[PDB]
UniProtKB/Swiss-Prot annotation:
Annotated function: In T-helper 2 (Th2) cells, regulates the magnitude of NFAT-driven transcription of a specific subset of cytokine genes, including IL3, IL4, IL5 and IL13, but not IL2. Recruits PRMT1 to the IL4 promoter; this leads to enhancement of histone H4 'Arg-3'-methylation and facilitates subsequent histone acetylation at the IL4 locus, thus promotes robust cytokine expression. Down-regulates formation of poly-SUMO chains by UBE2I/UBC9.
Places the protein is found: Nucleus; Cytoplasm
Organism listed in the record: Mus musculus (Mouse)
Maturation and modification: Methylation at the N-terminus by PRMT1 modulates interaction with the NFAT complex and results in augmented cytokine production.
Portion of the full sequence shown: 339 to 412 of 412
UniProt-recorded name of the protein: NFATC2-interacting protein
Amino acid sequence: GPLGSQELRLRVQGKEKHQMLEISLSPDSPLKVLMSHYEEAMGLSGHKLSFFFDGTKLSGKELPADLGLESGDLIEVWG
């Protein structure tokens, strides 16, 4: 389909220096998938977190192409 099939390798960084996840995100996965994986990795389910890509706050409904994500990009997590 129009999204193609190139996996996006991303790093996700929270407020603690050790809060780092690397994730391979499928182009057909909404950003909520990344948000859930981050929460699980870091033991933060239920926490009120705000995720940003290059300053844009994520709802989790975005697809990577909505944001223009590419491998090697970073997602920042506040909270």
